[PDB]
Amino acid sequence: MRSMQGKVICATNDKTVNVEVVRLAPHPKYKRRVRKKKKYQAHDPDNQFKVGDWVQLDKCRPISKTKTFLAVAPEGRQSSATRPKP
Amino acid sequence: TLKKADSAAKRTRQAETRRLRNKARKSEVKTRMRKVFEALDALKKKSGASTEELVPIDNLIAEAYSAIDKAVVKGTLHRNTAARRKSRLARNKKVVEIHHGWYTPSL
Amino acid sequence: MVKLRLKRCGRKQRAVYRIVAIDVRSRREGRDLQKVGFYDPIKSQTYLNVPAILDFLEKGAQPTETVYDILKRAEVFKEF
């Protein structure tokens, strides 16, 4: 399906990262949307990603008792690069 | 005399006899593998030239492979378990020879 | 294996079968892969949807005697 985009809370460990993914859900009864946040152990060979990074999160085989997810380069995001002003 | 429990009894006895066959076929493997590991330790530690010492080692290796597969097709083992036993032996045989000096792939 | 057989529906004394493609180890009325034929003795009602039948006979589904001979009457064994 669609992969999950998030930001990194912890880089400290080797070949891994700890991502936080925020999603909104329409709470079952009261029809307002809510932010629920979940954390993941993402496998990141090469340790390219630092803390604060905004990374896309992908699915693969189990690497550990926790990490199922491949850390993957940010998928599509709006350029924080300045644009013309006509 | 007339005996009726086919299912239970007959299957129980069969289970014994087959069990002993299986035990044999496995013991074989743990054994010949073990001799291989003794030969590999003895070679890893000392200095002989492999070209020479690999002959007894490969007689033992060929034996253990024979035991392995005989026990696959006799069917005490699952083939995919076999593959790992063999790959283990191959790996050790490859480990000692890098210590000594003949072969090292790098790219 | 996959079997094409009858599952018994309807009521006490009045019995009506569906012809179904289902794994041989599920119960007689248990869950199935596909519903195919319809059968019934008393109304003498019988008919089958043949594309499914053939697609299962092709993948190796084995019928049961009654069914076997139903497919016979409807000439599905000739096309095969």
Binding site: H27, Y30, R32, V34 | - | -
Partner: protein, 122 residues
């Protein structure tokens, strides 16, 4: 009131509390009378009411009302009790089914007989 506050689970129901805890989810229970005696009703209803104490199978002891006119019940009798409240007598939450087990039917009652456990007269 505030949405954000309801989403913290601010609406919780009051559960349904039974009027006859001693029955434990049953239509009737059987018990043995420990005592059979009279009590006076809360004023201004003056009379003498026929109540027994019954020790039940579910282990409880309760005080059950006995209906109709007159009765044969005495201690170590095995009766059958059912639910329902006598608004007069404080604490009395249970009746005693007449015509079953050790309670006989009311004698000579001609009307609404099923409520008292009496045969039809021929």
């Amino acid at each position: 009131p505030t949405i954000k506050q309801l989403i913290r689970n601010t609406r919780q129901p009051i559960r349904n509390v039974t009027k006859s805890p001693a029955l434990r989810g049953c239509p009737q229970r059987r018990g043995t009378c420990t005592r059979v005696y009279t009590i006076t009703p809360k004023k201004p209803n003056s009379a003498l009411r026929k109540v027994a104490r019954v020790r039940l199978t579910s282990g409880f002891e309760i005080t059950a009302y006995i209906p109709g006119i007159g009765h044969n019940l005495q201690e170590h009798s095995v009766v059958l009790v059912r639910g329902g409240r006598v608004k007069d007598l404080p604490g009395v939450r249970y009746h005693i089914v007449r015509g079953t087990l050790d309670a006989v039917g009311v004698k000579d009652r001609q009307q609404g007989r099923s409520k008292y456990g009496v045969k039809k007269p021929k």
